């Protein structure tokens, strides 16, 4: 229906939009460069919208990836997408192993209310705050990291994946509580506790060791799961998902044991989500036929479970329930790619009508801490399926609304798999020459006016602008030059000497500096002004994203020589700020922007 | 009883303290420089503790000053102070000839509003704000402006004072209106309307010039001249003042023509302010017996009563009223000068326990627009006569009581004249060597902070301050200087190539300019930091009386040699703002304060 394989090209490009860094060779985000660079662990992902690292969706988001590799990595050779998928994945599992601290890990790397409450690209985040990290021993949290290192072990045939996975599991089971788990509360507090990790990585630790002691494991928890309201049945009536992964467990059990336990638990937790219910009791559906969940990222949940689906169907024989569980798979996928009341995509940079206002900080690309400037995202976050729709199929593209139009590692994690084994099934071609180049503003610009001039005197308000966004970025050896033309003053008998340099407001904390009037050739001269700690210009808010300073170029008093008009830096300058490229732009000795007399 | 002379001497005095810009070289007011020189007509009078020039007091003022020579000028020879009286009024009638426009006037500079939301000195006010004019015919205003002139003519033997007089008189009773007459509304608002002006002025007039057409015009104005409630009777009820100078043209008249019906006036005014009244009607008195005719300036209405009733009584025979009237008079001025319940004089300077807050801008002497700094008056407002206390005696010497610390031209008018009439009876000798000099604070000067100290710089935070009183004043050519000593430099091998300048902060609207470090002798170097136009650095308001500029001289980053500790500059400061006399202060050339290196 869909072309899946583009579809799943870019849904595996967004994870290399959320690296922090240092960012691999292979990274293919122009817009992205080493961010969080001062973190206690490197790498890794950031969460959603914005710089938080939270372990627990982070692995789950990659036991996903892993999963999705381990189920269809060979039948994916058409898409071309493997590698990809396989170094994305890698790139996670490597931060998770760098966590390691023996009795305990680190499990957080920000704070989320001081995170969450700027709005900027994370490339300049340092400037604007200073990022803790968290350490403890949570079993959710370890568990989950846990798992995501044991199908990372199959996947990627990895032995150092494998002993690490060995080594949380077995601290996850030791610490058998949430208690140090306390960094996340609120974002992603444990709601479902700890049980459903233990058992969903001793699950993968049977599967990547054969030892049947982690088999005896897993089923030693499944009396400790959640039940169902009062009932004795194990919960079924939710979706797998970062906080909760025993559905997914259950479906691998049914497999590997062959037991009638597991069956009937996959069958009634499945058919509760297909349009058939179970029994008469069935999760909630739009009108438009999308399974909704829950108000948060239902587009994820929906996806996630197809991807349940698929894989249980493929696992089965019997035809009528392979069927219903392939048809109701493959409409949450094709759903959340435009076979919905729209007619349109929840994927970012994909199909029909895509969101083109996610929620995301560094995909936006401001330079002044606001939501509502820029008004278009200066990027393209490819491959994002976004929350989605609410109950009754609505929907706006709205950056303010952090429900519909967030997005997220875990949203994305389920959606990868069953996109693989739709593009399995269906072929499709990516495209070529992915991602193509993105449009560029200028970044590094004076913006200038005429604040007085007279007949013995220009006086210049300047401010030297750092937007960058391809990728944000920090410059400490910054400045500008002002170029004149002192033929006037010559042809009236005075010199150099004669004209004086004065300044009439300099920023707080900009420090800065002014050289004297400087020889280019002929008669053009030109002062400099050059920044101490360019770094403290940047796209961070309203303050820091232009350096102002007023200075002024002054012939004697009683005076009336001075003549601005054949200046070169004078040119087109108004009593208006405007971008000038006549005051040009210096890395240290490189020109970044403008022009040059001459030159 | 009291020193009546001096009395007089300071009450003259209090005008001086008044004058506009330019002042005249006999102005004995040290705290007092040419303010208000971009004013549309120059000289004249501030009205009272402010720099509105308002016409209708200020000619009232001039009138009443001329009345006590015309009556009293041969009488007070032994005060010494005619030739002081006889200038200072001159001062104010060559403001009122100045005013002229021919067929109108200006009538008022500066606007009630806009001039009395600011606090602060007179001659710096310009920085603060532009002045308006304001020009008419209205005839309270004109009328009251040919009095001053007409009186002034005889008592100065002036020609160009009568011609303009005249010309006055001709515009106001042509006009009839106070239309024209709004811009003191609120201030000095015609509340008895202008007949009493025109009565006031034909009076003055006749006896200019013994022309009878003008005797003949102040005789057809009185009927329309406002009645005594729904009675026939002329209004008596009220004081001689601003407003309604009726009662004395009724007192001149009485004395110039004889007739019964102008001394039955006379009489029922009078009678009406004495302690047994009118026929059961009297004026307010206090318990203290100070006749109190309305919340504001009660002592100005009686004193000028008092004036009123010693020139009637000397005019007289009755021993009966001459008594009643005299005892009166001399009752109420005594009270002003300290027989009253707190046995306080109530004029500035002058007896026992005189007010020393009065609500006088200028005498205060503020920098920075507050009326609560400094605590205590910078200047002595001598001879002022204040608003005084209230319906019971009580009084309070603070400068936020608006009305019993007022103080004002018209204050002091009518009780000059009293005093002359006190003087010419009694004698007294004025003070020797009046006024003495004031003690002064620093009025131009650094206040310097350390705002970082590290081993390869030093960070100062500078504010030059312009808190000027004596008087305050307006300087172009400010700068400071940094004195540093680079011996710890030179050993260890740099040189002053390699110690660099640069600014973190200069306060917008402040065109500074910093030197090269500059060798004054052997290891001894500074910066001269100099603002252009130093004018900007005013004691206008919080941000104006000083400017503050961030510099940090710096050795370069990684070196450990940077001393600070001998610099002549740095001695004694701290991380806290404060004045230092090791940061001089120059206007051009010249040093005005603190020290250099070299004694
Ligand atoms: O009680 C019903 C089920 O709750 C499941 O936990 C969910 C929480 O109830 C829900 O608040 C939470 O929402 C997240 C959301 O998933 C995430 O995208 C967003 O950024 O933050 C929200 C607040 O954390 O989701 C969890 C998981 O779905 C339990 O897992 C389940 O056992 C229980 O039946
Ligand atoms: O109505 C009674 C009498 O009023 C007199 O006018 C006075 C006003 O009523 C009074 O409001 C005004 O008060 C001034 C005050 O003199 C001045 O010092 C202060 O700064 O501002 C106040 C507001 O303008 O004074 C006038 C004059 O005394 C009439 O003159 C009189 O005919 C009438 O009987
Ligand atoms: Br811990
Ligand atoms: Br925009
Ligand atoms: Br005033
Ligand atoms: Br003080
Ligand atoms: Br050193
Ligand atoms: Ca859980
Ligand atoms: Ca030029
Ligand atoms: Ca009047
Ligand atoms: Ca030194
Ligand atoms: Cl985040
Ligand atoms: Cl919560
Ligand atoms: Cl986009
Ligand atoms: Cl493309
Ligand atoms: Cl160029
Ligand atoms: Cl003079
Ligand atoms: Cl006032
Ligand atoms: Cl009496
Ligand atoms: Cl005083
Ligand atoms: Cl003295
Ligand atoms: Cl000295």
């Known amino acids: 229906s869909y072309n899946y394989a583009e579809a799943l090209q870019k849904a595996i490009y967004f994870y290399e939009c959320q690296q922090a860094g240092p960012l691999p060779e292979w ?18 992902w950031y969460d959603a919208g914005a710089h938080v690292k939270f372990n627990l969706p982070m692995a789950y988001s990659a036991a996903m990836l892993g999963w999705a590799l381990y189920e269809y990595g060979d039948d994916i050779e058409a898409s071309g997408q493997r590698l990809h998928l396989e170094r994305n994945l890698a790139f996670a599992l490597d931060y998770l192993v760098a966590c390691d601290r023996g009795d305990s890990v680190v499990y957080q790397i920000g704070d989320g209310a001081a995170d969450h409450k700027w709005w900027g690209s994370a490339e300049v985040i340092e400037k604007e705050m200073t990022r803790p990290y968290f350490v403890g021993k949570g079993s959710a949290v370890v568990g989950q990291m846990a798992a995501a290192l044991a199908v990372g072990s199959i996947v990627l045939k990895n032995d150092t994946y494998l002993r690490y996975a060995k080594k949380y599991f077995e601290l996850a089971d030791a610490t058998r509580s ?15 506790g700890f049980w459903d990790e233990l058992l969903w990585a001793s699950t993968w630790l049977y599967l990547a060791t054969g030892d049947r002691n982690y088999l005896d494991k897993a089923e030693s928890y499944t009396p400790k799961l959640n039940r169902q309201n ?12 970062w906080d909760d992964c025993h559905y997914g467990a259950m479906i691998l059990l049914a497999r590997a044991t062959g037991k009638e336990e597991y069956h009937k638990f996959a069958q009634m937790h499945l058919d509760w989500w297909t349009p ?72 970012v940079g994909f199909g029909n009508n895509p969101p083109q206002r ?21 990027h393209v976050l490819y491959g994002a399926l976004v929350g989605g729709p609410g109950r009754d199929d609505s929907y706006e593209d709205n950056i303010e609304d952090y429900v519909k139009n967030e997005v997220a590692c875990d949203y994305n994690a389920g959606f990868v798999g069953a996109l693989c084994r739709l593009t399995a099934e269906y072929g499709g071609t990516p495209l070529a020459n992915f991602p193509p180049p993105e449009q560029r503003d200028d970044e590094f610009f004076v913006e200038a006016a005429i604040n007085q001039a007279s007949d013995h005197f220009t006086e210049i308000k300047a401010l030297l602008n750092n937007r960058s966004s391809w990728p944000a970025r920090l410059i400490k050896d910054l400045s500008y ?32 500096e ?4 400087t020889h280019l050739y002929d008669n053009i001269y030109y002062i400099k002004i050059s920044y101490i700690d360019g770094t403290n210009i940047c796209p961070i808010g309203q303050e820091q994203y232009a350096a102002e300073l007023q200075f002024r170029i002054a012939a004697p008093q009683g005076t009336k ?8 830096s004078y040119q087109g300058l108004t009593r208006e700020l405007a971008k000038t490229k006549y005051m040009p732009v210096f890395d240290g000795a490189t020109k970044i922007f403008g022009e040059v007399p001459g030159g």
């Open 27 to 44: 990274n293919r985000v122009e817009w992205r460069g080493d961010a969080t660079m001062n973190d206690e662990v490197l790498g890794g």
């Open 178 to 192: 949430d208690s140090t788990y306390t960094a996340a509360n609120g974002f992603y507090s444990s709601h479902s």
């Open 230 to 241: 009062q009932t004795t049945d194990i919960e079924y009536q939710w979706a797998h998902c």
């Open 276 to 347: 058939q219910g179970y029994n008469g009791k069935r999760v909630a559906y739009t009108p438009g036929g999308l399974a909704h969940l829950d108000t948060w990222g239902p587009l994820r949940y929906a996806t996630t479970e197809a991807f349940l689906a698929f894989v249980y169907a493929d696992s089965i024989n019997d035809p009528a329930l392979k069927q219903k569980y392939y048809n109701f798979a493959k409409s949450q996928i094709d759903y959340a790619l435009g076979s919905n009341p729209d007619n349109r995509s929840y994927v």
């Open 358 to 378: 996610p929620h995301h900080r560094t995909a936006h690309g401001t330079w002044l801490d606001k939501r509502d400037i820029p008004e278009k995202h200066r």
């Open 481 to 512: 030059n002002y170029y004149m033309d002192l033929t006037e003053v010559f042809e009236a008998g005075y010199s150099v000497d004669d004209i004086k340099v004065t300044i009439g407001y300099c920023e707080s904390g900009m420090d800065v």
């Open 514 to 517: 002014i050289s004297p009037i």
């Open 561 to 568: 020589f001075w003549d601005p008009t054949n200046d070169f």
